[PDB]
Amino acid sequence: DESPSFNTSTNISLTFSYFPDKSGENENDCDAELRIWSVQEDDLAAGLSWIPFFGPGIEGLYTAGLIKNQNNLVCRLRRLANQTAKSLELLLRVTTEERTFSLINRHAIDFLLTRWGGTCKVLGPDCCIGIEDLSKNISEQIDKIRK
Amino acid sequence: DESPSFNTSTNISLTFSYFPDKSGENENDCDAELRIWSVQEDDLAAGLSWIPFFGPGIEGLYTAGLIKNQNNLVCRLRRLANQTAKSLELLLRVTTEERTFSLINRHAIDFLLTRWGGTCKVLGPDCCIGIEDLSKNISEQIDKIRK
Amino acid sequence: DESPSFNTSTNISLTFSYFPDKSGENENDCDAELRIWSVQEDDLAAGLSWIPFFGPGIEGLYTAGLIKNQNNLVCRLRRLANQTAKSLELLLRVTTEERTFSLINRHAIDFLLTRWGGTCKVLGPDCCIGIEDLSKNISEQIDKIRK
Amino acid sequence: VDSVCSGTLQKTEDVHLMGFTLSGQKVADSPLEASKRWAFRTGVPPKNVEYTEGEEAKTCYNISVTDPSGKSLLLDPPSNIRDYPKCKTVHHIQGQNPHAQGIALHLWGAFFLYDRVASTTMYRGKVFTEGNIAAMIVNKTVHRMIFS
Amino acid sequence: VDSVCSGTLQKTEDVHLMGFTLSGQKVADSPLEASKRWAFRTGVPPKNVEYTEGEEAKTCYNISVTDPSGKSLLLDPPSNIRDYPKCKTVHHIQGQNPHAQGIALHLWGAFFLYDRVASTTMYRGKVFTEGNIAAMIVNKTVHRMIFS
Amino acid sequence: VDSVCSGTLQKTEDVHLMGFTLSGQKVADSPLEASKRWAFRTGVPPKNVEYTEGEEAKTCYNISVTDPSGKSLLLDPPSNIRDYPKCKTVHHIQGQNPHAQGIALHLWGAFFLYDRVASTTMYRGKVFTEGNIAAMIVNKTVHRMIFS
Numbered sequence: 001d002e003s004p005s006f007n008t009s010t011n012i013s014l015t016f017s018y019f020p021d022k023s024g025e026n027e028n029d030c031d032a033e034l035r036i037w038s039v040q041e042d043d044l045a046a047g048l049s050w051i052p053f054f055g056p057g058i059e060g061l062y063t064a065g066l067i068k069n070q071n072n073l074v075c076r077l078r079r080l081a082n083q084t085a086k087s088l089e090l091l092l093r094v095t096t097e098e099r100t101f102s103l104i105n106r107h108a109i110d111f112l113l114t115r116w117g118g119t120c121k122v123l124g125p126d127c128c129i130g131i132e133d134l135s136k137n138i139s140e141q142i143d144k145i146r147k
Numbered sequence: 148d149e150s151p152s153f154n155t156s157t158n159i160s161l162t163f164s165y166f167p168d169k170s171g172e173n174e175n176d177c178d179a180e181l182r183i184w185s186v187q188e189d190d191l192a193a194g195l196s197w198i199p200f201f202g203p204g205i206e207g208l209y210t211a212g213l214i215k216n217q218n219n220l221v222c223r224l225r226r227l228a229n230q231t232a233k234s235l236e237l238l239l240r241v242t243t244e245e246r247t248f249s250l251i252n253r254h255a256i257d258f259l260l261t262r263w264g265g266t267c268k269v270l271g272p273d274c275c276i277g278i279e280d281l282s283k284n285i286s287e288q289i290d291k292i293r294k
Numbered sequence: 295d296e297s298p299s300f301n302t303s304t305n306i307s308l309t310f311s312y313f314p315d316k317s318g319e320n321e322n323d324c325d326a327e328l329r330i331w332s333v334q335e336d337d338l339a340a341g342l343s344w345i346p347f348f349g350p351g352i353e354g355l356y357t358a359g360l361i362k363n364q365n366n367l368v369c370r371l372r373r374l375a376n377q378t379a380k381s382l383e384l385l386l387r388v389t390t391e392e393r394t395f396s397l398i399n400r401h402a403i404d405f406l407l408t409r410w411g412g413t414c415k416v417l418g419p420d421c422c423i424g425i426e427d428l429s430k431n432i433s434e435q436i437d438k439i440r441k
Numbered sequence: 442v443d444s445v446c447s448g449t450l451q452k453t454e455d456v457h458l459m460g461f462t463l464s465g466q467k468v469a470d471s472p473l474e475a476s477k478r479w480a481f482r483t484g485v486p487p488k489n490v491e492y493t494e495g496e497e498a499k500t501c502y503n504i505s506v507t508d509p510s511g512k513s514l515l516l517d518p519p520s521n522i523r524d525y526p527k528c529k530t531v532h533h534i535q536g537q538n539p540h541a542q543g544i545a546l547h548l549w550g551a552f553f554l555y556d557r558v559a560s561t562t563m564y565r566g567k568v569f570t571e572g573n574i575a576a577m578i579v580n581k582t583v584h585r586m587i588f589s
Numbered sequence: 590v591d592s593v594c595s596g597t598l599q600k601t602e603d604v605h606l607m608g609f610t611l612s613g614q615k616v617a618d619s620p621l622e623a624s625k626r627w628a629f630r631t632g633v634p635p636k637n638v639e640y641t642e643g644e645e646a647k648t649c650y651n652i653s654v655t656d657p658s659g660k661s662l663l664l665d666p667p668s669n670i671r672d673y674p675k676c677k678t679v680h681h682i683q684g685q686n687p688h689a690q691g692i693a694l695h696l697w698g699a700f701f702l703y704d705r706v707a708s709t710t711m712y713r714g715k716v717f718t719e720g721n722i723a724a725m726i727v728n729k730t731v732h733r734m735i736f737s
Numbered sequence: 738v739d740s741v742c743s744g745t746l747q748k749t750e751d752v753h754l755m756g757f758t759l760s761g762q763k764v765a766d767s768p769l770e771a772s773k774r775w776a777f778r779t780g781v782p783p784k785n786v787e788y789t790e791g792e793e794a795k796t797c798y799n800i801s802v803t804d805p806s807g808k809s810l811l812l813d814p815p816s817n818i819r820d821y822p823k824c825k826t827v828h829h830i831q832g833q834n835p836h837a838q839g840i841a842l843h844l845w846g847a848f849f850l851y852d853r854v855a856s857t858t859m860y861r862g863k864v865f866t867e868g869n870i871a872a873m874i875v876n877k878t879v880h881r882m883i884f885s
């Protein structure tokens with residue numbers, strides 16, 4: 001469909017838009033606990049932290065987070081990774097570059113292509129456009145016709 | 148204009164949107180026959196084909212295809228490659244990276260930039276937006292005014 | 295906000311959309327003169343210039359330009375570089391690829407994401423869409439109702 | 442919501458690729474078991490792909506395998522390959538294979554995970570864990586709450 | 590249709606870069622003729638660019654050229670350079686140049702084509718064919734019918 | 738105009754990344770002063786990033802630094818690192834450090850600028866100047882008038 005999103009609630013309530021129901025998936029084959037690491041993206045916590053030299057270095061480079069299985073999302077995350085694999089291997093088969101691959105930029109482009117590669121049919125499925133303020137203005141114009 | 152497209156008919160009828168007429172190009176300086184190769188993008192033909200290990204390997208890696216000169220498209224394809232060259236060399240001059248270059252991602256971005264870098268003038272040239280369902284809804288609203 | 299643009303006037307009058315006022319920035323800590331170099335992107339000046347072999351080579355590779363401080367833009371350019379640094383270092387921290395990084399493609403994608411990642415509210419801030427020709431057509435339709 | 446338009450991506454930074462382990466998928470990870478999923482083969486070019494965040498690993502492996510003559514059967518690590526960030530237990534293994542050729546390829550199609558880099562092959566002397574990755578949209582605000 | 594909006598690009602995968610040969614452009618490809626289009630030069634940095642599909646090649650070349658002292662005048666191939674996929678006839682050539690310096694650059698501005706990689710220069714010991722590439726949009730459905 | 742929609746980007750080519758020097762920021766650039774901004778450190782992986790245009794440099798440096806044993810403390814330059822394009826005065830420096838370890842990292846967080854490549858570290862034997870880069874939109878027409 002489109003890269004799933006990971007929202008907060010409606011502490012730390014989490015929402016994960018991907019459901020494997022949209023694949024025979026039921027019960028649990030995953031750990032509810034999910035501890036994870038990410039590169040320190042802190043904003044001037046040490047003041048000079050942004051500078052490589054004053055940066056923590058590989059040892060203190062990472063930050064830790066925890067995602068709980070509130071809506072069985074973790075397992076859905078877990079499952080998702082398992083299924084992503086095939087397409088990802090096939091993608092890489094095609095690539096000749098061995099050194100790296102920016103999957104990140106690929107997803108960003110594909111996101112845009114899905115919503116803007118094609119042509120829009122106003123107020124239609126598969127296209128994003130908002131007419132509430134346009135139609136309100138159409139209605140406001142008809143209100144101005146008075147006298 | 149925009150990356151040409153290669154459609155099927157309206158076996159294997161093919162349509163190629165690029166015409167060099169839009170350049171003194173006439174007759175033929177190309178072979179009508181065009182046999183080509185592409186990396187096996189088959190979907191589980193061998194079941195475990197996606198996995199690198201169970202993948203065919205470099206020798207069986209490629210799939211073969213044939214494009215006929217139904218509308219002299221092959222020669223147009225052929226010509227197109229010849230003209231692409233100059234811009235492509237100039238592009239590469241600018242790049243410092245020698246190892247590789249993702250021309251593929253560049254084209255994808257440029258495609259989007261042409262249709263969305265700018266600002267839209269509804270029902271206008273150079274912009275993609277569909278008003279048939281929006282204007283139909285405007286018309287449906289005027290029909291609802293009855294009684 | 296969005297990648298600043300560098301326009302010409304409204305010889306060589308120049309306009310630079312970035313103002314650090316949008317940061318305590320006043321007076322001058324920069325040279326008004328700005329001489330710069332860019333890779334020869336000339337179009338067939340030597341006829342065979344595009345071809346690598348017939349290309350000038352590293353020594354004659356560059357072209358020279360001059361940007362004057364007409365509206366103190368150079369210093370704004372200069373300041374801009376100074377502030378870009380932090381975000382740029384943080385960006386690179388995250389990247390594992392050492393060899394290179396296409397910041398250019400990243401900006402192009404982010405440009406599009408800002409104007410099309412979300413959903414549009416017609417005639418609204420933060421979204422680009424043109425209704426002058428659409429509303430004119432709505433008005434032209436109402437004019438056609440006559441008799 | 443099930444709509445194509447559901448979800449917003451404001452910057453590319455908000456695309457997050459998370460590495461999840463096979464141990465987190467209740468898969469046997471003992472060295473003797475784990476190695477039954479690894480195999481040597483020729484004609485396949487190793488591929489690498491960058492990712493952004495990953496699960497703390499239960500177990501990891503630091504492996505060197507050669508041929509009898511002492512020449513490694515595992516590829517030398519590229520500049521951008523660093524040891525996996527957070528391993529609870531590392532299994533250091535060093536030895537030789539009597540009759541094997543090519544490079545180490547994961548059988549399941551899973552990836553060899555290092556520090557923000559997933560690979561179709563095993564790199565000599567680098568700490569890795571097995572896993573798969575998944576793509577999702579997380580804005581900075583959501584990101585800040587989790588990692589803090 | 591001649592409109593900017595004509596054509597749809599749903600995934601990046603649907604961008605296809607095809608390599609067409611110069612032999613397919615009825616250009617003399619005999620080794621003695623072909624070599625008249627190749628030349629050595631300094632001050633130019635070799636550039637490479639990835640492509641997706643290509644024409645079956647009529648002829649290819651597997652060349653090594655050095656200076657009199659035995660040092661190659663051709664660059665060593667990068668990890669990602671593989672022999673051209675489908676050559677009908679390969680011309681293996683190995684020799685030395687008495688007074689040449691720099692790297693091999695195609696005169697016409699055409700590219701040295703390998704396996705899904707086009708280059709402004711000739712790589713030592715790798716099979717290549719001369720050609721140019723062209724960009725187009727092909728969806729999977731169209732792609733599946735052709736290649737099958 | 739202050740609007741998000743203000744500004745048009747038609748091709749990716751129109752994104753320009755300009756390198757501005759620290760000398761252009763009225764910063765002392767004498768070798769003895771300049772070197773007070775450079776320092777050695779471990780645990781940091783050098784990063785490089787491509788840019789498109791740059792300011793003519795007032796001063797540049799061509800530096801090689803080793804440890805007492807003669808082994809360079811500076812990284813060997815990658816294929817894509819070329820000497821800075823336009824330096825008015827180059828400061829060639831070659832020596833050794835009695836007790837330093839790791840790689841050369843700029844203290845200010847500024848970049849080591851080469852030919853269309855900015856880096857978090859100093860490369861051995863390559864001409865560089867210190868600076869920062871800035872992103873902007875310039876169409877070809879605007880670009881043609883400036884550079885000509």
Ligand SMILES: *[C@@H]1O[C@H](CO)[C@@H](O[C@@H]2O[C@H](CO)[C@@H](O[C@@H]3O[C@H](CO)[C@@H](O)[C@H](O)[C@@H]3O)[C@H](O)[C@H]2NC(C)=O)[C@H](O)[C@H]1NC(C)=O
Pocket residue numbers: 503504505524533535565566567568
């Ligand atoms: C993962 O396992 C590898 C071994 O398979 C460990 O690599 C070892 O790292 C040390 C320190 O860099 C090396 O020791 C030094 O080697 C040089 C020669 O290269 C020698 O002159 C020094 O006196 C010293 O012994 C060691 O050789 C290297 N081994 C290999 C095969 O590369 C690595 O440290 C392990 N990782 C972790 C996180 O423990």
Ligand SMILES: *[C@@H]1O[C@H](CO)[C@@H](O[C@@H]2O[C@H](CO)[C@@H](O[C@@H]3O[C@H](CO)[C@@H](O)[C@H](O)[C@@H]3O)[C@H](O)[C@H]2NC(C)=O)[C@H](O)[C@H]1NC(C)=O
Pocket residue numbers: 651652653672681683713714715716
């Ligand atoms: C294209 O031509 C090159 C030669 O220009 C061919 O490369 C040759 O490949 C073989 C097999 O890899 C090499 O043979 C082996 O060399 C090692 C030493 O490196 C030696 O110990 C072995 O006993 C054996 O002889 C050969 O040296 C290599 N030549 C060069 C110059 O690299 C290549 O195979 C040709 N491609 C095709 C498709 O035929």
Ligand SMILES: *[C@@H]1O[C@H](CO)[C@@H](O[C@@H]2O[C@H](CO)[C@@H](O[C@@H]3O[C@H](CO)[C@@H](O)[C@H](O)[C@@H]3O)[C@H](O)[C@H]2NC(C)=O)[C@H](O)[C@H]1NC(C)=O
Pocket residue numbers: 799800801820829831861862863864
């Ligand atoms: C920047 O400074 C470096 C030195 O730190 C200069 O590099 C030097 O370049 C020359 C020419 O390539 C090298 O000379 C030759 O070296 C070979 C051995 O590699 C020798 O056989 C030749 O007879 C000749 O002497 C020199 O070794 C090299 N030095 C280093 C340390 O790499 C570079 O030229 C300077 N850049 C500018 C723009 O002046």
Ligand SMILES: *[C@@H]1O[C@H](CO)[C@@H](O[C@@H]2O[C@H](CO)[C@@H](O)[C@H](O)[C@H]2NC(C)=O)[C@H](O)[C@H]1NC(C)=O
Pocket residue numbers: 006007008010580581582583
């Ligand atoms: C980051 O994403 C979150 C959603 O996961 C955004 O939060 C909600 O945004 C909507 C629309 O502005 C509001 O109606 C909600 O009240 C927000 N909820 C919370 C808890 O903040 C958030 O705005 C996004 N942040 C940024 C800076 O874009």
Ligand SMILES: *[C@@H]1O[C@H](CO)[C@@H](O[C@@H]2O[C@H](CO)[C@@H](O)[C@H](O)[C@H]2NC(C)=O)[C@H](O)[C@H]1NC(C)=O
Pocket residue numbers: 153154155157728729730731
């Ligand atoms: C792949 O592209 C082809 C065109 O080359 C699409 O085929 C046509 O699509 C239109 C619009 O849905 C239909 O009106 C035609 O009848 C289709 N023709 C054929 C022969 O299929 C095709 O839909 C595209 N495939 C996908 C999955 O997007």
Ligand SMILES: *[C@@H]1O[C@H](CO)[C@@H](O[C@@H]2O[C@H](CO)[C@@H](O)[C@H](O)[C@H]2NC(C)=O)[C@H](O)[C@H]1NC(C)=O
Pocket residue numbers: 300301302304876877878879
């Ligand atoms: C390049 O950008 C410039 C602006 O910096 C464009 O110039 C103006 O474009 C508008 C809209 O077409 C006109 O109303 C102005 O009269 C133009 N001014 C000048 C001096 O040309 C220019 O059109 C852009 N070029 C291209 C080819 O897109």
Ligand SMILES: *[C@@H]1O[C@H](CO)[C@@H](O[C@@H]2O[C@H](CO)[C@@H](O)[C@H](O)[C@H]2NC(C)=O)[C@H](O)[C@H]1NC(C)=O
Pocket residue numbers: 082085086466468549550551572573
């Ligand atoms: C995703 O996880 C599943 C579940 O374990 C893996 O399925 C295993 O696949 C191997 C190889 O075909 C079998 O021997 C096992 O019996 C399977 N396990 C189960 C429980 O059925 C699957 O291979 C994994 N794939 C990836 C990419 O991780």
Ligand SMILES: *[C@@H]1O[C@H](CO)[C@@H](O[C@@H]2O[C@H](CO)[C@@H](O)[C@H](O)[C@H]2NC(C)=O)[C@H](O)[C@H]1NC(C)=O
Pocket residue numbers: 229232233614616697698699720721
């Ligand atoms: C594209 O093909 C044309 C047609 O062959 C090439 O034109 C040749 O160019 C060379 C070098 O300038 C001349 O010596 C030949 O006489 C030209 N051929 C003809 C038939 O006129 C052109 O160079 C090719 N360019 C690329 C990029 O492939």
Ligand SMILES: *[C@@H]1O[C@H](CO)[C@@H](O[C@@H]2O[C@H](CO)[C@@H](O)[C@H](O)[C@H]2NC(C)=O)[C@H](O)[C@H]1NC(C)=O
Pocket residue numbers: 376379380762764845846847868869
């Ligand atoms: C941007 O320029 C400013 C102005 O010079 C730099 O500020 C200097 O920072 C160093 C290190 O913290 C101080 O020792 C100096 O006193 C500062 N100068 C002034 C005039 O205040 C800043 O570091 C530069 N940053 C980048 C990325 O170039």
